[PDB]
């Protein structure tokens, strides 16, 4: 009763870390692509400054 309980809840902790890790990776990736568009557009505009 102690063993099966501890094992089942340890799997829940591991499932949480994995799910949160994947969600975070998707956000970091998307945010990088958006930030790169700022850098590119800012550069393509600044390059024309008199």
């Amino acid at each position: 009763g102690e063993k099966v309980k501890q094992v089942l809840l340890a799997q829940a902790e591991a499932e949480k870390i994995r799910k949160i890790g994947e969600a975070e990776a998707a956000v970091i990736e998307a945010m990088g692509k958006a930030e790169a568009e700022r850098m590119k557009l800012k550069a393509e505009a600044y390059q024309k400054y008199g």
Partner: protein, 53 residues
């Protein structure tokens, strides 16, 4: 003297029931209780190990 020659045979039975039998019962209790303590600690060890991995 004849009375105490029977007191010998007396103590030889009293001591078996008072001294020996309970010490022997304690030994069996300790042994089968030890297996349970060991069994719980190996199961707990496996649980802690699985939780870490």
């Amino acid at each position: 003297v004849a009375v105490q020659e029977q007191e010998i045979a007396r103590r030889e039975k009293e001591l078996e029931a008072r001294v020996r039998k309970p010490a022997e019962a304690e030994r069996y209790k300790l042994e089968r209780l030890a297996e349970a303590e060991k069994s719980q600690l190996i199961m707990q060890a496996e649980a802690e190990a699985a939780s870490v991995r």
